[PDB]
Amino acid sequence: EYKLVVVGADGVGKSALTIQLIQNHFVDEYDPTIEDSYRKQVVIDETCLLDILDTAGQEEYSAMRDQYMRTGEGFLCVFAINFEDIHHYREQIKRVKDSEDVPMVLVGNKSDLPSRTVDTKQAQDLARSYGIPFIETSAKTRQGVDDAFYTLVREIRKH
Amino acid sequence: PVLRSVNSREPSQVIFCNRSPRVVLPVWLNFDGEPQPYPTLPPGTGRRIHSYRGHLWLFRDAGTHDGLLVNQTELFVPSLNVDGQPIFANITLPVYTLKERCLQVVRSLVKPENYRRLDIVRSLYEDLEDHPNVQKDLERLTQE
Amino acid sequence: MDVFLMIRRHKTTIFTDAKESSTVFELKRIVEGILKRPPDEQRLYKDDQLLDDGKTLGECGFTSQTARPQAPATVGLAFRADDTFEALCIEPFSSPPELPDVM
Amino acid sequence: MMYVKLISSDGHEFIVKREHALTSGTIKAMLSTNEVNFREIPSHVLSKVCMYFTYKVRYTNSSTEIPEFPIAPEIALELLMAANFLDC
Numbered sequence: 001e002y003k004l005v006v007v008g009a010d011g012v013g014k015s016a017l018t019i020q021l022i023q024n025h026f027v028d029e030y031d032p033t034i035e036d037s038y039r040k041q042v043v044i045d046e047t048c049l050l051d052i053l054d055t056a057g058q059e060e061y062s063a064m065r066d067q068y069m070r071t072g073e074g075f076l077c078v079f080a081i082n083f084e085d086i087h088h089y090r091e092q093i094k095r096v097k098d099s100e101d102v103p104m105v106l107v108g109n110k111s112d113l114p115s116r117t118v119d120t121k122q123a124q125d126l127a128r129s130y131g132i133p134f135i136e137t138s139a140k141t142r143q144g145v146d147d148a149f150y151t152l153v154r155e156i157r158k159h
Numbered sequence: 160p161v162l163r164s165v166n167s168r169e170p171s172q173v174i175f176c177n178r179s180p181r182v183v184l185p186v187w188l189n190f191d192g193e194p195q196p197y198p199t200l201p202p203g204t205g206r207r208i209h210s211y212r213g214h215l216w217l218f219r220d221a222g223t224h225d226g227l228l229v230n231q232t233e234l235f236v237p238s239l240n241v242d243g244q245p246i247f248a249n250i251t252l253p254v255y256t257l258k259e260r261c262l263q264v265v266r267s268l269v270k271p272e273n274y275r276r277l278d279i280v281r282s283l284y285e286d287l288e289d290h291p292n293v294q295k296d297l298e299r300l301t302q303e
Numbered sequence: 304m305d306v307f308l309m310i311r312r313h314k315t316t317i318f319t320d321a322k323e324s325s326t327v328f329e330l331k332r333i334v335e336g337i338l339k340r341p342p343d344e345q346r347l348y349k350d351d352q353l354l355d356d357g358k359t360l361g362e363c364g365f366t367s368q369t370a371r372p373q374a375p376a377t378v379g380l381a382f383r384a385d386d387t388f389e390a391l392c393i394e395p396f397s398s399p400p401e402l403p404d405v406m
Numbered sequence: 407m408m409y410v411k412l413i414s415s416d417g418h419e420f421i422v423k424r425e426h427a428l429t430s431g432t433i434k435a436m437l438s439t440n441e442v443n444f445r446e447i448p449s450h451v452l453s454k455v456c457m458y459f460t461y462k463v464r465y466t467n468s469s470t471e472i473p474e475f476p477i478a479p480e481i482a483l484e485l486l487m488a489a490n491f492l493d494c
């Protein structure tokens with residue numbers, strides 16, 4: 001079993017990527033407030049249960065939310081390709097997990113939107129500084145959604 | 160609590176530089192003043208942590224909880240970040256009293272249960288068993 | 304740069320500090336101030352090797368790494384009496400007991 | 407330079423600076439005198455004690471890093487007792 005957590009900002013589309021991976025249908029205007037975890041038996045390279053944990057809700061640095069995030073062994077940091085709060089997210093994952101080399105994967109979603117305010121080379125340079133792969137993804141186009149979750153699983157295996 | 164972090168929520172980039180032969184545990188005193196353990200730093204390593212203004216940090220040896228110094232003092236409060244430059248925090252060994260240094264050495268060589276087997280005066284056993292405590296040092300610091 | 308010294312003769316040990324760039328003669332002038340003897344009467348040695356007055360302390364081998372406050376480096380001293388320099392003699396320190404097994 | 411002379415139980419004689427030797431509260435009390443005699447502190451400990459007196463003073467009020475004071479395991483107990491007696 002592999003435990004994957006999908007961290008990211010508002011409207012960045014974290015729920016859409018996990019619904020695309022599991023339900024295989026694109027969700028329009030999915031509830032930002034609702035937070036649910038989904039389990040899925042998938043074949044990668046190995047039959048395993050890659051259980052996602054779409055994150056949602058208001059900023060809470062309580063002991064309880066920390067422990068909930070600490071449980072996930074793989075993190076998918078998502079940002080819209082249309083700001084730099086990602087370092088905050090990455091620095092907080094690093095705190096609860098107590099590691100500089102947590103299995104993580106930078107993901108720039110909404111990569112079908114023609115307006116990009118972030119350079120693709122800029123993110124992969126950031127991903128290179130972190131030491132983690134960057135997978136471009138489009139939940140509407142259903143492109144790269146599987147790769148991001150799958151490369152996170154391979155990073156967890158490498159760990 | 161006199162000794163606590165101010166909930167400023169104002170980001171201040173800081174450099175934690177371990178200039179001590181010991182593994183350093185940064186400890187962050189939270190808003191209620193309770194010490195929080197943060198990732199350790201191996202001897203010689205430097206890391207650009209992201210903290211906040213008015214935050215209150217102290218630093219100890221990670222295995223024995225011996226006290227360490229930061230910028231020639233016991234505590235460190237990130238100052239107003241200027242033109243993006245990081246605030247530097249040099250973690251260093253204090254000049255410990257010779258007695259305390261000896262207690263540190265004996266504590267490492269002798270498991271706690273065999274302190275009383277050592278050929279030392281009984282006053283020294285009580286000293287041996289009086290291990291370094293972050294909370295006890297905090298009360299002294301509040302007094303000062 | 305400062306070097307830190309244990310000048311040692313018989314059962315007498317001087318702890319003093321000196322710049323690495325000072326000279327063996329300047330250091331004999333400092334032992335003069337302590338042990339009240341002229342440099343002509345004093346012989347300074349590193350290990351068994353005699354040290355010439357003109358050489359600087361760094362050339363002899365006393366450096367920051369070699370001579371430290373926590374672990375100082377030892378200069379032997381021999382005094383001259385009746386125009387005869389004495390054999391270099393440094394009486395050893397006591398020895399600690401065997402490590403207790405609990406240690 | 408003002409020195410003081412410290413004598414161990416086995417008759418070894420150590421010349422240290424006064425300011426350095428004043429790092430011990432006990433020694434400060436006895437000098438309050440350019441010679442102190444210790445009949446219970448052997449030479450290998452009182453020489454090691456004498457290196458602490460140079461370590462302190464040199465590294466006290468040091469803005470930069472400080473090296474660790476090394477204590478070999480064999481001398482540790484004796485150094486502990488002597489420090490306890492000397493308040494340093």
Ligand SMILES: Nc1nc2c(ncn2[C@@H]2O[C@H](COP(=O)(O)OP(=O)(O)O)[C@@H](O)[C@H]2O)c(=O)[nH]1
Nearest residue numbers: 011012013014015016028029032110138139140
């Ligand atoms: N065009 C496009 N829209 C997306 C994509 N991914 C997410 N969205 C939209 O962005 C919004 C974000 O919703 P949600 O997934 O709840 O965001 P979250 O709060 O970050 O989880 C949704 O209305 C999605 O329809 C994408 O790849 N392309």
Ligand SMILES: [Mg+2]
Nearest residue numbers: 015054055056
């Ligand atoms: Mg969501």
